[PDB]
Design a protein around this ligand. Structure first.
Ligand code: YIO
Ligand code: YIO
Ligand code: CL
Ligand code: CL
Ligand code: CL
Ligand code: CL
Ligand code: CL
Lengths: 131, 131
């Protein structure tokens, strides 16, 4: 089935975001499938007890409610460092271990076309904005 | 009265980047001050033995040379997440403890104008491109 392992099932995590719709289904995987059938579903809350799947467009608004679990449209969106929705290849990728952020800022200043940088871990990466 | 604490003074870090100017100065702080008086200086290398201060426009090109230290135009550029040269506050910063990065993806999808996100330390940050 669809992968539902990236979010907790047993921590009563709900989202209050306004619903696109609500449907009874027997599993988190079915809830995700219903999310994926709607072009604007970002996430869903599935309740184990009520068997209600609540599909949502907006950003999550987490809260506690018994038997809730909140998943993403797909667990495959696993980027965490610099994540462009439409994709974006870096101008440059350099090792700046032992360097302050301000030197990665300098690398960007000094690179024609650089609009922004990210500096997670040891990696100074330079980006141009999406065309 | 200029902050030179953000880079190392005693690790023999030079930069081979082509210079914009060379002067002799008494301290790393005076070298930074020289860099800040030149609109295109991105960084500098100061040598504690020769007292030579080399101001540089291009991206750093790090290498090892005894007595060298390489600082940024200013230590104030301390953004390390996703950092725009023109400034650009996040659309949102949230504590996403206990959440997968996919739910930050979801947040970006559901947030008008969000073009990219980062997810460091379980902190979801949304950004719009500047325009
Ligand atoms: O299952 C609880 C359920 O309750 C509704 S009315 C909420 O807005 C949902 O997101 C979900 O938490
Ligand atoms: O202080 C030694 C000096 O060497 C020159 S030739 C480099 O280009 C400078 O940046 C600096 O590393
Ligand atoms: Cl769990
Ligand atoms: Cl139903
Ligand atoms: Cl430029
Ligand atoms: Cl880090
Ligand atoms: Cl949009």
């Amino acid at each position: 089935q669809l992968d539902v392992s990236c979010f907790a099932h047993d921590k009563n995590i709900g989202s209050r975001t306004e619903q696109l719709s609500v449907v009874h289904v027997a599993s988190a995987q079915d809830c995700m499938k219903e999310c994926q059938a709607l072009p604007t579903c970002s996430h869903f809350t599935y309740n184990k007890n009520s068997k209600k799947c609540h599909l949502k467009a907006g950003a999550p608004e987490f809260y506690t409610y018994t038997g809730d679990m909140t998943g993403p449209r797909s667990c495959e969106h696993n980027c965490s460092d610099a994540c462009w929705m439409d994709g974006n290849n870096p101008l440059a990728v350099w090792d700046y271990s032992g360097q302050p952020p301000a030197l990665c800022w300098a690398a960007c200043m000094g690179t024609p076309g650089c609009d922004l940088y990210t500096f997670q871990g040891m990696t100074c990466k330079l980006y141009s904005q999406t065309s």
